[PDB]
Design an enzyme around this catalytic site. Structure first.
Site, mmCIF file in Angstrom:
data_model
loop_
_atom_site.group_PDB
_atom_site.id
_atom_site.type_symbol
_atom_site.label_atom_id
_atom_site.label_comp_id
_atom_site.label_asym_id
_atom_site.label_seq_id
_atom_site.Cartn_x
_atom_site.Cartn_y
_atom_site.Cartn_z
ATOM 1 N N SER A 24 0.820 -0.985 0.100
ATOM 2 C CA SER A 24 0.041 0.022 -0.120
ATOM 3 C C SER A 24 0.846 1.415 -0.024
ATOM 4 C CB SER A 24 -0.732 0.036 1.174
ATOM 5 O OG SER A 24 -1.778 -1.023 1.264
ATOM 6 N N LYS B 275 -6.948 2.043 -2.466
ATOM 7 C CA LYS B 275 -6.611 1.840 -0.878
ATOM 8 C C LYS B 275 -6.469 2.950 -0.223
ATOM 9 C CE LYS B 275 -5.498 -0.255 2.521
ATOM 10 N NZ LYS B 275 -4.162 -0.508 3.025
ATOM 11 N N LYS C 257 0.899 6.524 8.064
ATOM 12 C CA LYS C 257 1.441 6.209 6.911
ATOM 13 C C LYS C 257 0.635 6.448 5.742
ATOM 14 C CE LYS C 257 2.199 2.236 4.345
ATOM 15 N NZ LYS C 257 0.924 1.811 4.333
#
EC number: 1.1.1.60
Lengths: 296, 296, 297, 296
Positions: free
Chosen positions: D96, D171, D239
């Protein structure tokens, strides 16, 4: 009078090298990526293959590059300032980059015997050519003394903030105050004009009390007059706010006004204002209100 | 016998402002409808009356100084209020810091009686009211402003007419948006500086020369560094002033993200026991949000 | 079950369909004509009109108040010849208006002083849910009073829950509105991010629906945002009023609620671009204005 | 059935590779940084010296690394996936990472003659072991259909969202909705608890209407019960939120709630919550309100 290298002789660098030669110093340049300028090579400069040689010959080696990655590259590239740095030599990073990255760079530069100074400049091309830039320095006092006269040749508001990494932290803190003070004046004037009042009269009245600031004097006027021609572009301020926000995320700080200011700058860029003066933040908030504080 | 002035609201600032008008040789008139007339005002020559109406019937100028919008609407238009005693050549001066939109409606009802209206909110607290160094921002007719100008000169220093009725209150709210956001700006930058290892006093000292320079950085910044937050301008008060700004933003469709967040940070300050702290203590809200103090 | 004598003060957009469903269930309606004439349809279906809310309270077992704002609730409750004046033992006063949770607790104490019981039952679902008896009702009050009024709530709604305690129904309503405004904003910022990056918002929504990002808002409002269907179901003005209540409470009770604070500023953008009467799904249009980029053609 | 390389055999990569082995696939591993897990070798996996060799052997090469520069490294490093890839080979990035970096990586890999699929996963070690991961895929429809039996062995909810970059975009958009829905429930239950209501009954009441979501059902209950043990860590959401904020700065998006969510996550980390389940965002808001929704 000392031998001085200057990696990054561009909009603010070439001018800065000029007011250094002017002081009586011999400047050395690098041709590893770009070509050596005309008014530098003629007025007393020596072209070199790499920043290493430049570091090998010069005592003070100054760096002025756009962002953190460019500082790391010129420092630790094969044939970079590091390979040529040694005892009694001083690397002065005059770029405005990550303070955390700066502390790691200072440490690697000291492993060669050389010393390191972080001296980001607050002023703009109005200080770069006119040798009146503001300079915030991070490093040991011994080293700062050595480079102290060099700074005087390019600027006047020179200060030692603390150890390595404190000069970059000071530039970032200034950029937070500058961006938030612009937004403070922008939100207050949009309110004033939305309530039917004249922003110029409100500015006059507010400039006498605790609302007084250099931003209200300068940027407040521009917001009222519609003089948004670039001096400090929004994109440069987006880069500086990103340094503050990366630092806040890395060190666990909740700074909500700095976070919001970045998003307002993004609206300004979305409406074609990436190259406007940072004072043009008002036009983002104006777009956000569907109302201008100006008859336009 | 310079002028016959009435004064409804002789409290923490009203009384010193009234005493200063008596020092200038003015004839004072008070109302006893709700509160008893102060002893220092009565001994110095003030004349007590029953209702604000009799005050308005006797005096040429009638000053009002009450805590918020509903209390201004009351003294003006209740039975035996200022409006029922107001008429041609009488000037009603609201010196309260209230809704600029409610002010516009008040002014029109006072003008219907033949009287004039001046919205002249003050900035300076009890210290500035006692010392007559207050900042007065005035909305109203230019002649009416010149008539009342020698009276404002006895209670304040920085006196400016912003524009028509409502524009004085509008400038006052704008002043409070900048002060709050300027405090948050100094606080966010100083929290970032200390969290990155730099000395917050040396960062403040360094930033005070350039574009980040402000009255807030000079005064409130010292408070944040030295830790002196004993009340001068309570956060509770600034919360009321910011609510006036945010209500106007909801009514006139303004997206002011930094003002909206400043109120939230103030609520954090109150949540940690700081309703009565000076507004400089906003830092302590951010310091609580970062689990880190820029002191000790 | 028990057919009760029920008074209804507030036969407007929500009250009239609500009052019509109580009559459908077999209840006896009592209306007040102190401010308005009794609706011809409510009278035709068997309602009785009395001169004021006091007579209604004296006659009925339950008294419902479905009015728009906090001052109107206070008015019908404590005015001369109001509900409180006609209230006493074994009578239940039910406020189904959405007003301040702090003002509600006060009204309930003055109502209980008479010996009457009080329930705060704010509803969610709008005119179409009132007309369809599908409204969700969040109630604050005594468990015995709640079970006594439960068959009535069942005639006007479906998801009926006692949050427990006078004021807790209004508090739940506000919490409901914080989530609906923020879930709209979450779908809107995510779909704007997706479309700005070249992705199809409809395919991103489909992928996201089968996971942790799944919600009634992603399913209903997400589709509206992709299709451009923003005709009011629930106006933004209404949600601005609801968020103003939450933000008033946050300031009074010392809460730092940044996303609720921000969503109100984004609702102000939508109104500024002519969207006070759009469905709250059109919050995306404000962010689209802020990004100068629409997720639709 | 197919020869499959797997760079990144960790908490999620190992169970994913184990599940591919379970479907009768030939696994190929790389020992260039870490030793190939014993459980994988004990079942038929072949350990090779580098990802270039792995790519030469396999038809599909799956990458599962922590961030963008790690994907950049395993792909374009000396003896990396690219200089071992070519026609008919399929490179699948299951990490990701940045959708922008992804589009640039996709065009370089397609130049080797190979095809590229960005297939980020949602779920933890639990979903990886149970093969119930959600997979969002960006790439060519044929290439997707080829990897589809591979995706079905590792996950359950698999969807092709578009061309290259769109899987990572979906995502990042999913992580915006997750963090913002967590903040929506935390803000609403804090408000309810501070008003005297039981957060548990509020959740029960809100689950039958429009405020209902999988976050209100799962995370809402965790916030009410105090069960904040690591399912999904805040460091990891931080993140993911930074990928959204970098993309917003790159494409000029004003996303104020995503921007604020990151600030609230930093407050959670300042109070020692980097490893809490992202449901513990409430603890940050509780600190900021000096008040918990649970009995202390």
């Amino acid at each position: 009078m000392a031998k001085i290298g200057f990696i990054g002789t561009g909009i603010m660098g070439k001018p800065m090298a000029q007011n250094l030669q002017k002081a009586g110093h011999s400047l050395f340049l690098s041709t590893h990526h770009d070509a050596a300028p005309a008014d530098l090579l003629e007025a007393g400069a020596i072209a070199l293959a790499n920043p290493k040689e430049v570091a090998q010959e010069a005592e003070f080696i100054i760096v002025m590059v756009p962002d953190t990655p460019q500082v790391e590259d010129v420092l630790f590239r094969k044939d970079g300032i590091a390979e040529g740095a040694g005892p009694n030599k001083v690397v002065i990073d005059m770029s405005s980059i990550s303070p955390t990255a700066t502390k790691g760079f200072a440490e690697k530069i000291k492993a060669t015997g050389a010393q390191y100074l972080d001296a980001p400049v607050s002023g703009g091309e109005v200080g770069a050519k006119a040798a009146t830039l503001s300079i915030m320095v991070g490093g040991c006092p011994n080293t700062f003394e050595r480079a102290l006269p060099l700074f005087q040749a390019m600027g006047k508001n020179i200060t030692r903030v603390g150890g390595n990494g404190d000069g970059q932290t000071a530039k970032v803190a200034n950029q937070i105050i500058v961006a938030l003070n612009i937004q403070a004046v922008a939100e207050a004037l949009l309110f004033a004009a939305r309530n039917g009042a004249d922003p110029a009269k409100v500015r006059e009245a507010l400039m006498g009390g605790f609302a007084s600031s250099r931003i209200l004097e300068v940027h407040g006027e521009r917001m009222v007059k519609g003089t948004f021609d670039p001096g400090f572009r929004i994109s440069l301020h987006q880069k500086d706010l990103n340094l503050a926000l990366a630092g806040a995320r890395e060190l666990n700080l909740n700074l909500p006004n700095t976070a919001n200011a970045q998003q307002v700058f993004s609206t300004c860029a979305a409406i074609g204002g990436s190259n406007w003066d940072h004072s043009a933040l008002i036009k983002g908030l104006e777009h956000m209100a569907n109302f201008s504080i100006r008859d336009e």
